[PDB]
Amino acid sequence: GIFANCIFCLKVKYLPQQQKKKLQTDIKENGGKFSFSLNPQCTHIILDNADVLSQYQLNSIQKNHVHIANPDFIWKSIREKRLLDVKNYDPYKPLDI
């Protein structure tokens, strides 16, 4: 599926439970894996609007080339049946991270 070889750290604490579940099932049903912890093996980190990242986390993300994205990256990729350009879904783009 479109998320093959993708490992998503999910930081989506403030999403409704139904949406958290749907993000997870969208990821798993389309070849991806997810974790709630950020580690070097993560390829992506999904951040809802109300979640933020520490400087420590941002440093880890830079070092390990993790893509920061919003939930829309998942929703839209699923809708379009195609892995989209993750650079257009980066909440920390304003910081150039």
Residue numbers in the entry: 4 to 100
What do the authors of the reporting publication say about this deposited model?
pmcPARP4 is an ADP-ribosyltransferase (ART) that uses NAD+ as substrate to add ADP-ribose onto target proteins, a process called mono(ADP-ribosylation) or MARylation. PARP4 is also referred to as vault PARP since it can localize to the vault particle, a cytoplasmic ribonucleoprotein complex.
The BRCT domain was crystallized using sitting drop vapor diffusion. Molecular replacement phasing of the diffraction data was realized using the AlphaFold predicted structure of PARP4 BRCT domain. Crystals of the BRCT domain diffracted to 1.75 Å and belong to space group F23 with one molecule in the asymmetric unit; the refined structure has a crystallographic R/RFREE of 0.175/0.188. However, there were several regions that required significant manual adjustments, and the final refined X-ray structure relative to the starting AlphaFold structure yielded an RMSD of 2.0 Å (comparing all 751 main chain and sidechain atoms). The major differences exist in loop regions connecting the core secondary structure elements, for example, the residues connecting strands β2 and β3 in the central beta-sheet. The general fold of the PARP4 BRCT resembles the structure of PARP1 BRCT domain, though the comparison shows some key differences in the positioning of residues that are important for PARP1 BRCT interaction with nucleic acid. The Thr420-Gly421-Thr422 motif in PARP1 is Ser38-Phe39-Ser40 in PARP4 and thus not highly conserved.
